[model samples]
Target: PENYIRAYSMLKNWVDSSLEIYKPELSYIMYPIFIYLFLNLVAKNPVYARRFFDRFSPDFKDFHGSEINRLFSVNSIDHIKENEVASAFQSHKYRITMSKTTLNLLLYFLNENESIGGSLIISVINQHLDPNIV
Candidate 1:
């Protein structure tokens, strides 16, 4: 009985130490892929993007709803910059790069008229590419 108890204690200590050693490696492997997927989703979809902003707006809203307005204004400019960078990728003769998921999401934004920011993005694309061609 004493030998059995000693063996159990040793096994439990080994398991606990192994878990401590593995935890940091597991977190390192998981966190970057998770962040990448999250950024990809936000970059691709304005609706999802807006929803993301909305999640934080409540915390920042300071009685007048202007915080959400300000956030949206800044986010709109950031979206424009993202679209411009994506456009450059598309325009490159050799790159053959375009994210259809992003394009479809942009179209969704355009169709919904969810915000002036989205409409402006659509208008810019239409002026440059002609929506029919897309």
Candidate 2:
């Protein structure tokens, strides 16, 4: 149940540990990942969906605040199927641009920790993200 949040937290920690020059591009990854996490939980457990949202949505507040608020309305499985924003997220992969070095660093980290929520995070990246390496 908490595994989703745990995975995201670990990703955040990894991003934070990265070099300052790369932080901006890396930080962009968090919002879409956060969206996917919240939406996934909404289908299985509304309680935990809100729990996840309340817990981590603040980190994205400055940049993604409006989108977060929009997503907050999607609190049920039915909403997930019908909501425009929710459907948009599921239908289109989120695009993030990062350096090849940063991409390699992220993939390596995700691979190394595969057993402890890394695999889950990796799947999200593979399915939902378009990591445009530069």
Best candidate according to TM-score: 2
**Cα lDDT for residue 106, model 1?**
40
| Candidate 1 residue lDDT tens string, 11-66 | 22332454454433322222222222223334566555555445434533444254
Off by over 4 Å in 1: 1-18, 49-134
Count of steric clashes across candidates, in order: 0, 0
Q: Per-residue lDDT tens digits of candidate 2, residues 39-81?
A: 8889888988898899999998898777778888888999887
TM-scores for every candidate against the unseen true structure: 0.24, 0.93
In model 1, the Cα lDDT at residue 130 comes to 26
TM-score of 2: 0.93
Error of 1 at 91 (Å): 18
